[PDB]
Design a protein around this nucleic acid. Structure first.
Ligand SMILES: Nc1nc(=O)n([C@@H]2CS[C@H](COP(=O)(O)OP(=O)(O)OP(=O)(O)O)O2)cc1F
Ligand SMILES: OC[C@H]1O[C@@](CO)(O[C@H]2O[C@H](CO)[C@@H](O)[C@H](O)[C@H]2O)[C@@H](O)[C@@H]1O
Ligand SMILES: [Ca+2]
Ligand SMILES: [N+]
Lengths: 553, 415
DNA sequence: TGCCCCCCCTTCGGTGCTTTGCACCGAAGGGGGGG
């Protein structure tokens, strides 16, 4: 006699009624394999048959298990999901083996027929109705309603997952010497107990679960390493991911590149140095998923470099709380960053990468800061603390950046590691006008209708320029005016603009941009030795600003 | 045997559904201990996924305090909860609190746990306690009593609050007491020794009801010493073209606040196309223009007053070298207060801690002056703030905020 | 031709000041992974 698992109250959204979707045609091969499964649920009591007073129905189908000889029954509750109340998911994240502490004895279990061992809400079972063709629609057929959590219902995962925790709660509290990682029905259990005591507690747990109707078949009972868990392989002292299959196809479609970049990301968690910039760059564009893409010279090398990393088998280690966490970052070029997290040198807990390009104009320091923020949050999730950082940026560079930037920014306790390429600021704007340097009053303007414009300057030494521009905008002409002044001035220059737009961009010392023009401006700024930018209001009759504003307007 | 005050949400509004953010090991351990004790005492009870609502939770340590304190980010629930002023349960704000020489802030939120919460409203207080490395799915709870940090707690508890304070208020008629969220603000013009003595009396006065994070803590304010930061124009004996350009820019900006400011005579000095470092003398007309502009900036702005029905907004500029400027307003260019902070904790080493301190300081001043907390415009990237601010939060409330990126083209509030 | 969670990369539309162009950001659809 099992302990009845208390039902979770479930309701439909107000004013909404059950689903009525009927069934789509099914192949005879599938219609046949289905009825056999339905009858088994009838026997075990998982499904009741009486359905004449039930006006609802939801389509049904089936697919096979992952490399198994068993079909899987699925119900398209998409319509019922819309009319069902909203739930708060209790699954907040995915455990990671680098967060595990070493244990002397370990076990991995799986609950057999998880969803079908949890009693569904009495009042809700009527809406889970579904019809299966008896014989190609020759006869009417067998209708059923679910007595337990079904597959396809948005409420099944959260309900089963919450019930699984209520069942385990008394076992854990009465056995604090044990660790249990519960992810759905998958179960990890480890202790430093003698193997004999461990097997004892394990069977006590198996009995506890069976006491609430939860079976733990021996086919899924892992007793010997390497334990397969969450897509990894858990050895006593080291862990690793399960082998990665890289498609080596010679003709690449859009979807092929998507699958490739996906596996590379998954591999980046332990294989250090993975890059996907040039490969993903092939994916940018409104191409159909089937269109064939020829790999670029850069993309082909990036794939080759990754292949070399994956050739060798890599393993991570487990977590020792008595030791500090170290996070080390290296710049990979073109806004790419890899890192390693470890407690002892060369024994990584895990690796990862950051390549997000956020913002039209940025620099390496901002990106290194973003990488630090990613690693910090990731570290809190997996271990609940911040690692000490080893960064390829000089204390002086960082001090110069964060003290001068107008936004608040910060990096937790960190030290410099001399591992080129180093991060640096590529130019510095003066805080005061430069004595004896030519003063360029720059300005630009464009016609909103014809999109034609002008950019130019006038200097205190009589130097002047106006350049005509086509297919442009006010903002672009303002950048162009600044660009001209940089090209036409010596190594030191004062520049007076009225473009808040251009000044905001440049004052943040970007070193990279999606704008060809801004990149050209950066290339000039790096060549200068002193550059003072100043803003003045327009149409105030100011110095060369009134003069330059008439020229280009 | 206490009847519960029925509470409703604002019509046409669902409950809060805010995700729980990751917690450091020290904060989770504190929460698991705090909730284990609150569950034994019935103040909270476990719930399941059938409850669709959720509010973030974490833990803080107040200034010079070594013990943890649970903090629920009820900002979303507080915005959706019925305004109790319409229910007449609003707490009036005393204009004389800012005038007292001293003001102590006592954490009285603990008393809210004695009052039960409306059954039908408890589902809206749901929160989830996470686990390290996601070993255990989220463990969800909900409140059965008045939870700390919810705007309804002090409102419902006010009827009980006034009675407890009855005897002390009648014995000390010159003392001001204001209630905001979990805090009590007690001000006097007494000497510090006598002031701290009266505060100790109020504590023991509370335990007289207690027998019938903790209360022992208190923080001292001195609003009579609070100063403002006006817009100032430098004083130079010689000016360069660049100086006058900056000045014309600043004045042109300031004219949105003071409509009488003129720059016509100063602009004409920049008539040529001169080198930025060229020293140019002030004309007779420009000399009077500058002096008259300084005069305008001395007097107050016309038509700026506090409207109790409008939200407060606070902007903050990082000026560098540990300096931080701020303005509080309800209508743009109608600042109710402008100020500056310097040499706070974090100065010269940690921007985020300093800004965190600034937000707390400004909120504390808004509560004392208007009984409102402002919505902040923060000069920081969203990700940078969300990664660190909880490491330095020391207040039992949390203000609303948004993120801005305003390059300082004109150093308007700090020369 | 299902359900729930996490991650990265690209796209796209809403939003607000740089303003009617441009920058930012969150949602979503693609992929990887877990059950
Ligand atoms: N593709 C999947 N869809 C699902 O709805 N599930 C759900 C959530 S986890 C739950 C587990 O199913 P049951 O235990 O029968 O399924 P199982 O294959 O994991 O386990 P087993 O055959 O009972 O040992 O099914 C799993 C899938 F892999
Ligand atoms: O930093 C804001 C950030 O916080 C979230 C989730 O915690 O919402 C909280 O903060 C908002 C900003 O003040 C509040 O409006 C909201 O009520 C509160 O829950 C996110 O929504 C937001 O990105
Ligand atoms: Ca299973
Ligand atoms: N113009």
């Amino acid at each position: 006699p099992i302990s009845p698992i208390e039902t979770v109250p479930v309701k439909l959204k107000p004013g909404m009624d059950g689903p009525k979707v009927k069934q789509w045609p099914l192949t005879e091969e599938k219609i046949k394999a289905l009825v056999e499964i339905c009858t088994e649920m009838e026997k075990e009591g998982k499904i009741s048959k009486i359905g004449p007073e039930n006006p609802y129905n939801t389509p049904v189908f089936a697919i096979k298990k992952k490399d198994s000889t068993k079909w899987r029954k699925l119900v398209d509750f998409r319509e019922l999901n819309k009319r069902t109340q909203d739930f708060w998911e209790v699954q907040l994240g995915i455990p990671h083996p680098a967060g595990l502490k070493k244990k002397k004895s370990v076990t991995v279990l799986d609950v057999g027929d998880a969803y079908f061992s949890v009693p569904l809400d009495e009042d809700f079972r009527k809406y889970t109705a579904f019809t299966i063709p008896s014989i190609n629609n020759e006869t009417p057929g067998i209708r059923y309603q679910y007595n337990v959590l079904p597959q396809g219902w948005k409420g099944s995962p959260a309900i089963f997952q919450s019930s699984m925790t209520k069942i385990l709660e008394p076992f854990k509290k009465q056995n604090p010497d044990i660790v249990i990682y519960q992810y759905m029905d998958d179960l990890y259990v480890g202790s430093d107990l003698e193997i004999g005591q461990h097997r004892t507690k394990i069977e006590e747990l198996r009995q506890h679960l069976l006491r609430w109707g939860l079976t733990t078949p021996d086919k899924k009972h892992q007793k010997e390493p390497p334990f397969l868990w969450m897509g990894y392989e858990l050895h006593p002292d080291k862990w690793t991911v399960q082998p990665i299959v890289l498609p080596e196809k010679d003709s690449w479609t859009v979807n092929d590149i998507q699958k490739l970049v996906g596996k590379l990301n998954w591999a980046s968690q332990i294989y250090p140095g993975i890059k996907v910039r040039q490969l993903s760059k092939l994916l940018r564009g409104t191409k159909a998923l089937t269109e064939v893409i020829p790999l670029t010279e850069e993309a082909e090398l990036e794939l080759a470099e990754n292949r070399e990393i994956l050739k060798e088998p890599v393993h991570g280690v487990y977590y020792d709380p008595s030791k500090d966490l170290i996070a080390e970052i290296q710049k990979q070029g073109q806004g790419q960053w890899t890192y390693q997290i470890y407690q002892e040198p060369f024994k990584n807990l895990k690796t990862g990468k950051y390549a997000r390009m956020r913002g039209a104009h940025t620099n390496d320091v901002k990106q290194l800061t973003e990488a630090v923020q990613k690693i910090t949050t990731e570290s809190i999730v997996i271990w609940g603390k911040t690692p000490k950082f080893k960064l390829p940026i000089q204390k002086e560079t960082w001090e110069t950046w964060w003290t001068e930037y107008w936004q608040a920014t910060w990096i937790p306790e960190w030290e410099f590691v001399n591992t080129p390429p180093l991060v640096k600021l590529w130019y510095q704007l003066e805080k005061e006008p430069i004595v004896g340097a030519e003063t360029f009053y720059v300005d630009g303007a464009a016609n909103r209708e014809t999109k034609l414009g002008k950019a130019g300057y006038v200097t205190n030494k009589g130097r002047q320029k106006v350049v005509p521009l086509t297919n442009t905008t006010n903002q672009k002409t303002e950048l162009q005016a600044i660009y001209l002044a940089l090209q036409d001035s010596g190594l030191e220059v004062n520049i007076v603009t009225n473009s808040q737009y251009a000044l905001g961009i440049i004052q943040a010392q970007p070193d990279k941009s999606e704008s060809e023009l801004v990149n050209q401006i950066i290339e000039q700024l790096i060549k200068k030795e002193k550059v003072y930018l100043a803003w003045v209001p327009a149409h105030k009759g100011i110095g060369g600003n009134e003069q330059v504003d008439k020229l280009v307007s | 045997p206490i009847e519960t005050v029925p509470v409703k949400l604002k019509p046409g509004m669902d409950g809060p559904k805010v995700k729980q953010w990751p917690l450091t090991e020290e904060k989770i351990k504190a929460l698991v201990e705090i909730c284990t004790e609150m569950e034994k005492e019935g103040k909270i009870s476990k719930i399941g996924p059938e409850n669709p609502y959720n509010t973030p939770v974490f833990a803080i340590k107040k200034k010079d305090s070594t013990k943890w304190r649970k903090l629920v980010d009820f900002r979303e629930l507080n915005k959706r909860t019925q305004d109790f002023w319409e229910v007449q349960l609003g707490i009036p704000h005393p204009a004389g609190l800012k005038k007292k020489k001293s003001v102590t802030v006592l954490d009285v939120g603990d008393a809210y746990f004695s009052v039960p919460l409306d059954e039908d409203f408890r589902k809206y207080t749901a929160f989830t306690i996470p686990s390290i490395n996601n070993e255990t799915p989220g463990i969800r709870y909900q409140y059965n009593v008045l939870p700390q940090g919810w705007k309804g707690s002090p409102a419902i508890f006010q009827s009980s609050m006034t009675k407890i304070l009855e005897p002390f208020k009648k014995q000390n008629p010159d003392i001001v007491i204001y209630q905001y969220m979990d805090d009590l603000y007690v001000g006097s013009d007494l000497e510090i020794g006598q002031h701290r003595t009266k505060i100790e009396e109020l504590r023991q006065h509370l335990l007289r009801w207690g027998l019938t994070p903790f209360l022992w803590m208190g923080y001292e304010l001195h609003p009579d010493k609070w100063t403002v930061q006006p817009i100032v124009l430098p004083e130079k004996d010689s000016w360069t073209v660049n100086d006058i350009q900056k000045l014309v820019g600043k004045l042109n900006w300031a004219s949105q606040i003071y409509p009488g400011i003129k720059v016509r005579q100063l602009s004409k000095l920049l008539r040529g196309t001169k080198a930025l470092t060229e020293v140019i003398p002030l004309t007779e007309e420009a000399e009077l223009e500058l002096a008259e502009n300084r005069e305008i900036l001395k007097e107050p702005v016309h038509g700026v007053y506090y409207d109790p029905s409008k939200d407060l907004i606070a902007e903050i500029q990082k000026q560098g070298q540990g300096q931080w400027t701020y303005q509080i307003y309800q209508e743009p260019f109608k600042n109710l207060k402008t100020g500056k902070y310097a040499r706070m904790r974090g100065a010269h080493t940690n921007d985020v801690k300093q800004l965190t301190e600034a937000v707390q300081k400004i909120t504390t001043e808004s509560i004392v002056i208007w009984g409102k907390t402002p919505k902040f415009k923060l000069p920081i990237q969203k990700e940078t703030w969300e990664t660190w601010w909880t490491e330095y939060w020391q207040a039992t409330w949390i203000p609303e905020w948004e993120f801005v990126n305003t390059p300082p083209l004109v150093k308007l509030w700090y020369q």
